[PDB]
Design a protein around this nucleic acid. Structure first.
Ligand SMILES: [Zn+2]
Ligand SMILES: [Zn+2]
Ligand SMILES: [Zn+2]
Lengths: 54, 154, 38, 604, 380
DNA sequence: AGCGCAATCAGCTGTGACTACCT
DNA sequence: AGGTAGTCACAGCTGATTGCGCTG
């Protein structure tokens, strides 16, 4: 059991490649509010980015 | 050392089983056992390995770089005259005996009593000054117990 | 890479205790270790 | 008492001022002693305070001591009396002794010699000069279990009674609570019952004056009492034990922690005691050098307190060893006495004097206080600063150099919390570069380096990357011996890696540089032991930690013992010539690849 | 019995009170007792010496390539030899040093026996990059040293220092005869080994009266060399031992006067580059030869040019200052001002010179006995 | 292919801190 | 909302198995 345990994890540990999750905010179409305000909503995590466009 | 074999080698009734180990201000001897050489190959003088070139080279290297650290006298005992002469022949064949010669003088003990005595005399006279010397002999010989290597000799 | 060496050196050599100590130096042996005296 | 600034103010309590600044001493009402080192009477004040109090910190300027009950018991154990100690405390006060210290001293030192514990004919008897105290402790229910067969009274001469041998620890624990502490005094001068041996130390083993003070305090008035002597590893500790064994002149028993310390003690006895090998025996189930019928017996812990089946030869040796009295049972590495199986070792054998020797008396779980009654009071505590001032202890330049966490490692460090972050700050690439630079710099100047590193998983990739010898720890017995042997007398190799193996007292050769990475949590004992492997600026030892990680707090809380000893840890933020030469993990590619392997443990 | 098994020492019993506050008097006594920790002598050993003609023999065999002393034996040996030469010339004014290098069973006289330290240091620096090959020959080195030192005057102590790294030496003839000849010639031979004890070196040192030692480490090597620096004791009076030497004044030339005469230095004339044709320097009092360094024996007339302050620096040993009579302040019915520093005498003890019966405080007494080596009052 | 020394695994324990569950 | 016994890492010891070497 020990000699099979010491080798069964060698291939298991070599399968996963990426651990950190990519967190790029993919905003959709902008929404226009009052006072020339523009808001972008992220489609992946719901992040709201409100900005004033010149 | 074994006090349990003498009472049975010869009919005897010991009642002592006593041994004594000398004590001084400092350790006057440095016994050590050297196994494998620099090539991590055993230097055992086994019968099947007596003709092995690697062990002979290891023995020659040990005698060479040992002769550069211990001054004025080295005594080396071999198992037998045949093995001693076969090892020194191999040392002569290679360019290793010359390196031992340039450190200490080589003296070979033989069966001739007069030759052995004169070799011992010249070994002593070489050890008296700074030249240094090597006394190659056999463990089961008349020179192993016939002389005592007092300080600065061997 | 050529730029990778520079980027790694910039990140490592000056991460926390350099972006302020160097600023103070710009604006301004017995206890020194042997590698700090050479 | 008042907290106007949050400080206990006792200005009104001790207003006495006859001489402005003649007396270099301060006292506190509850208990504390402050000493001025920059005084002409510094040595006399130190000698007075050592004998009556134990230190708490000894910096370069103002030494600070504390008064405890056991310190006063030790003081009155010596010929010092109540009047002498009180008058010499008031002699150097500069402020007047508060009327909360005099009463405490009186209460502690009055009840010292009332109760005695003696060993005779393999029987334990407790004898008191005052008969009334026996009836006073007669009502205690816990004591009644020790007395077997109704304890008819043992009418002799002086009132005494027998106590159970296996329950001697309980009564010692209860007596201090009963304000009647027990004393273990062995008058070896006149026994005539013990077969005193012919041991005699050679007249060539000179000892330093500080060892003279400890030995003299051990034998205050011609008798030997149990105690603890604290001396650094580089200092002479085994020599003190050998001299004490020679002076006691009785059957000595030496206990060690490891199976290699028995050989160390045997070598010390052979070097400084002039004892034949027939009398010297080692009992560690390796050679079995006929321990039956021996003068000095050397064994180890974890063998005298087995809870399982024992070997037949070992069983017979233990049966022989538990049937006679012992004089001066020397205990080595006394800090790990208060253990579940090591405490019973003292109660499983019978000895008159119990001597404890150690270098790092600090321990967690606050079980060191238990050692006050397990063995005895703290007899001697060496002043490490003045010891290194005399030049007989290496002046080690302590360093606490931290290395910033790389951005690729800190994200994983802050992302995980379930014990998986230990390898993250341990395998910091910046710390790796710092360690490599230190190793190379101290090799360029021919300095012997010992690199301590727990978490052997990290050590595996730490040592093979530098291609240097390392001690995994369960490797063998021979490989470790040969590596340590060729570490000293070889110029080609002068740096080794140790994983928690050198955290005890071994025969490691003289070294100058110590670089520890990823030690235990808050073990002040481990740091003190690792420092002790260097002293023997002659030397310097470094501690590498990772910033913004728990290792910072661990390093902060594990140096408070050494700063109490007087050491100062300089903080090193930048290493000179870091970019001058090439180091490992130069680029970001291999640094980010290291995350994959350091996250590959996944021990779930 | 044992010293520590008796009664525990109480060192704090010294201090006592009679008026509740005399601890100030006790600490004043302690502070006074702290001073005077010396024997009023900087050396306290050999107060004299003799002209030594020392020859230093350096091994040049392959054993010098060993890395026992970092980086190798040769470099550490030569560095410590430079230090030894500097210290030896500092502590011996009219001594001479010769350097012999033995290599390939032959001995090469690296430097002639002279008193110039700079020449020896330059020769050692040049020899740093030598080639270590062959085996040393003690016989040849001793023969060269004996041949050089046989004609030296008897009053000078003839000494040979041998640095023997290799454990083997090749002798073209019997060496014990050479040892007997050296013993008959009263030449002292001292050997400092590096590896281990060699019988021939021990016999040579014992027979010639020298000392044989083996190096433990670099610090021990430096200690042995420093011990060899010290001059040997000198007999009372042997014969008319004297020597004709000059004292060249450092007369530089100034163009403000009409006697500004530039001259080439004889020592610099042998250099490959342009010799220093400075305005002035050390002119020989006998033949007006110009030299820059001292002490250098004159090449032309053979006169020994030495510096008078160097010889005078050891004159205080011949006439040490006798210790002043310690007198309590109350018992001295005289002036209460120190004769050296004019300070008010408030110490419990006052020191009075035996000759002039002046008044000196503790600090001035220590300064006079340790550094000044002369009583200011006796000078007047 | 019988002995015997030596390498190896099991069981217990010390040191230190981390962590899940509930009155 | 707070505190103590499992638990993991790393080391030690002793008690057996068990596996390779064992003469000119
Ligand atoms: Zn001239
Ligand atoms: Zn004065
Ligand atoms: Zn005078």
């Amino acid at each position: 059991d020990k000699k099979v345990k010491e080798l069964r994890r060698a291939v298991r540990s070599s399968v996963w490649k990426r651990e950190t999750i990519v967190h790029q905010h993919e905003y959709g179409p902008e929404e226009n509010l009052e006072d020339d305000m523009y808001r972008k909503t992220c489609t992946m995590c719901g992040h709201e980015l409100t900005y004033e466009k010149m | 050392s074994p006090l349990d074999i003498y009472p049975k080698i010869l009919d005897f009734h010991p009642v002592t089983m006593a041994t004594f180990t000398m004590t001084l201000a400092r350790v006057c001897l440095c016994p050590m056992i050297i196994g494998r050489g620099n090539d991590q190959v055993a230097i055992s003088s086994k019968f099947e390995t007596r003709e092995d070139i690697a062990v002979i080279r290891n023995y020659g290297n040990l005698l060479l770089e040992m002769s550069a650290v211990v001054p004025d006298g080295i005594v080396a005992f071999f198992t037998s005259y045949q093995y001693m002469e076969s090892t020194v022949a191999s040392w002569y064949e290679q360019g290793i005996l010359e390196n031992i010669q340039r450190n200490k003088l080589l003296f070979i003990e033989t069966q001739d009593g007069a030759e052995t005595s004169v070799a011992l005399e010249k070994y002593q006279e070489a050890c008296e000054n700074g030249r240094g010397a090597i006394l190659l002999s056999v463990a089961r010989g008349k020179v192993s117990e016939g002389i005592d290597f007092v300080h600065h000799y061997g | 890479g050529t730029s990778s060496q520079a980027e790694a050196a910039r990140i490592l050599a000056a991460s926390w205790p350099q972006n302020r100590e160097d600023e103070e130096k710009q604006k301004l042996a017995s206890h020194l270790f042997p590698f700090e005296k050479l | 008492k008042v907290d106007e600034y949050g400080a206990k103010d006792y200005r009104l309590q001790m207003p006495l001022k006859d001489d402005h600044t003649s007396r270099p001493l301060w006292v506190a009402p509850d208990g504390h002693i402050f000493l001025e080192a920059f005084s002409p009477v510094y040595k006399y004040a130190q000698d007075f305070l050592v004998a009556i109090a134990e230190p708490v910190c000894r910096p370069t300027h103002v030494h600070e001591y504390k008064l405890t009950a056991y310190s006063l018991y030790a003081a009155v154990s010596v010929g010092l009396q109540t009047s002498d100690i009180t008058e010499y405390l008031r002699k150097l006060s500069k402020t007047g002794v508060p009327d909360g210290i005099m009463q405490f001293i009186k209460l502690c030192t009055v009840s010292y010699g009332k109760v005695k514990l003696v060993l005779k004919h393999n029987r334990y008897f407790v004898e008191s000069c005052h008969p009334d105290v026996i009836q006073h402790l007669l009502q205690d229910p816990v004591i009644r279990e020790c007395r077997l067969r109704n304890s008819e009274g043992e009418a002799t001469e002086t009132v005494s009674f027998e106590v159970k041998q296996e329950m001697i620890e309980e009564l010692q624990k209860r007596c201090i609570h009963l304000e009647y502490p027990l004393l273990a005094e062995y008058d070896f001068r006149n026994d005539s019952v013990n077969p005193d041996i012919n041991i005699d130390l050679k007249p060539t083993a000179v000892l330093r004056p500080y060892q003279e003070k400890s030995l003299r305090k051990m034998f205050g008035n011609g008798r030997a009492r149990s105690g603890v002597i604290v001396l650094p590893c580089g200092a002479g500790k085994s020599l003190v034990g050998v001299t004490a064994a020679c002076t006691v002149r009785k059957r000595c028993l030496v206990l060690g922690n490891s199976a290699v310390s028995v050989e160390q003690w045997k070598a010390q006895f052979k070097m400084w005691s002039t004892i034949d090998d027939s009398q010297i025996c080692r009992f560690t189930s390796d050679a079995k050098d006929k321990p039956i019928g021996c003068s000095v017996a050397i064994s180890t812990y974890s063998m005298l307190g087995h809870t399982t089946k024992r070997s037949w030869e070992a069983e017979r040796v233990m049966e022989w060893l538990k049937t006679q009295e012992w004089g001066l049972m020397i205990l080595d590495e006394v800090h790990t006495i208060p253990a579940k199986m090591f405490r019973r070792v003292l109660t499983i054998v019978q000895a008159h004097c119990k001597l404890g020797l150690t270098a790092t008396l600090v321990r967690e779980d606050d079980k060191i206080v238990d050692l006050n009654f397990l063995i005895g009071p703290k007899l001697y505590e060496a002043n490490w600063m003045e010891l290194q001032n005399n030049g007989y202890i290496a002046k080690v330049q302590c360093a606490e150099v931290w290395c910033p966490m790389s951005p690729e490692f800190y994200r994983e460090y802050v992302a995980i919390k379930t014990k998986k972050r230990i390898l993250l700050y341990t395998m910091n690439p910046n710390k790796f570069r710092a360690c490599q630079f230190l190793i190379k710099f101290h090799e360029r100047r021919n300095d012997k380096i010992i690199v301590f590193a727990d978490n052997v998983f990290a050590l595996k990739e730490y040592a093979i990357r530098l291609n240097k010898p390392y001690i995994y720890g369960p490797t063998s017995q021979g490989e470790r011996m040969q590596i340590l042997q060729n570490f000293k007398h070889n110029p080609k190799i002068n740096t080794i890696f140790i994983s928690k193996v050198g955290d005890t007292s071994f025969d490691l050769p003289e070294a100058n540089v110590l670089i520890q990475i990823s030690s235990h949590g808050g073990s002040r004992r481990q740091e003190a032991q690792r420092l002790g492997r260097v002293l023997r600026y002659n030397a310097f030892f470094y501690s590498l930690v990772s910033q913004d990680t728990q290792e910072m707090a661990y390093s902060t809380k594990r140096q408070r013992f050494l700063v109490d000893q007087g050491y100062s840890f300089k903080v090193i933020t930048k290493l000179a010539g870091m970019e001058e030469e090439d180091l490992a993990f130069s680029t970001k590619e291999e640094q980010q690849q290291l995350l994959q392997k350091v996250l590959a443990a996944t021990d779930l | 019995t044992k010293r520590w098994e008796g009664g525990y020492e109480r060192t704090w019993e010294i201090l006592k009170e009679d008026e509740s506050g005399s601890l100030k008097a006790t600490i004043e006594d302690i502070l006074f007792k702290a001073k005077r920790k010396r024997v009023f002598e900087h050396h306290g050993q050999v107060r004299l010496g003799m002209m030594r003609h020392l020859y230093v023999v350096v091994d040049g065999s392959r054993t010098m390539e060993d890395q026992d002393l970092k980086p190798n034996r040769l470099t550490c040996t030569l560095k410590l030899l430079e230090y030894f030469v500097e210290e030896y010339f500092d502590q011996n004014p009219i001594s001479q040093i010769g350097i012999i290098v033995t290599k390939s069973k032959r001995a090469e006289k690296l430097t002639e026996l002279s008193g110039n330290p700079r020449k020896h240091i330059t020769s050692l620096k040049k020899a740093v990059d030598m080639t270590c090959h062959g085996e040393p020959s003690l016989y040849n080195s001793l023969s060269i040293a004996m041949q050089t030192l046989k004609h030296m005057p008897g009053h000078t102590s003839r000494e040979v220092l041998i640095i023997f790294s290799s454990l083997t030496t090749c002798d073209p003839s019997n060496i014990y005869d050479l040892i007997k000849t050296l013993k008959a010639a009263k030449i002292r031979v001292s050997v400092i080994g590096l590896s281990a004890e060699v019988r021939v070196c021990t016999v040579l040192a014992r027979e010639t009266g020298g000392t044989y030692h083996v190096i433990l480490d670099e610090s021990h090597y430096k200690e042995l060399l420093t011990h060899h620096v010290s001059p040997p004791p000198a007999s009372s009076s042997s014969e008319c031992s004297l020597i004709r030497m000059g004292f060249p004044q450092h007369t530089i030339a100034s163009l403000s006067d009409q006697d500004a005469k530039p001259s080439f230095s004889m020592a610099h004339l042998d250099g490959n580059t342009e010799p220093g044709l400075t305005l002035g320097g050390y002119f020989c009092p006998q033949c007006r030869a110009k030299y820059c360094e001292l002490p250098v024996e004159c090449k032309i007339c053979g006169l020994t040019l030495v510096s008078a302050p160097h010889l005078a620096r050891s004159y205080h040993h011949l006439f040490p200052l006798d210790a002043f009579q310690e007198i309590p302040l109350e018992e001295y019915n005289g002036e209460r001002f120190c004769y050296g520093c004019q300070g008010e005498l408030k110490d419990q003890h006052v020191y009075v010179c035996a000759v002039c019966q002046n008044v000196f405080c503790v600090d001035c007494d220590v300064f006079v006995h340790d550094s000044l080596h002369c009583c200011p009052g006796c000078i007047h």
